[PDB]
Amino acid sequence: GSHMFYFLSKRRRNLLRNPCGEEDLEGWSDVEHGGDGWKVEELPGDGNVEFTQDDSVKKYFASSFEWCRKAQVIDLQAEGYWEELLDTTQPAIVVKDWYSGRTDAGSLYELTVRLLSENEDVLAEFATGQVAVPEDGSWMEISHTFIDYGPGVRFVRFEHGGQDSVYWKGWFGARVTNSSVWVEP
Ligand SMILES: [Cl-]
Ligand code: NI
Q: Where exactly is the site Important for carbohydrate binding?
């Protein structure tokens, strides 16, 4: 009620802008448009129809027949995570993403998240490599929690992407949405 655990718990919030495409590609950088590029689409066109545990999620980004990628760099200090706190406490940095594909074509997904120093030094890294998206159209979560990452972390670089497995014109690639980065104690 006055301790750091309480405050970090209270200030926990997604630090990624525009996680679902409500603002199109706004807030996303190093946007790479492989094939026909990224396209924001709405939930239930139907199919497998899952997106459970969060009904606020209405849209997703769909990738095409060559890699579509996009990234965001989060300034932890600017969001109020004190340099001293980051350096000695190294509080949990939790990154999550949701991906799915179509039932009429396979697709691939990849996530790379890095903790960077003030000068873009790569201090920590989580990387999925290329991942087979579920054939049945279901949404899959990926989650990684960075701990014990050492001093000097200032930025979180979140990068993800998708492509189809069929090389077809249109948007048959991996779909991504509800991406998150937050700090917890
Ligand atoms: Cl949140
Ligand atoms: Ni307290």
A: 47, 65
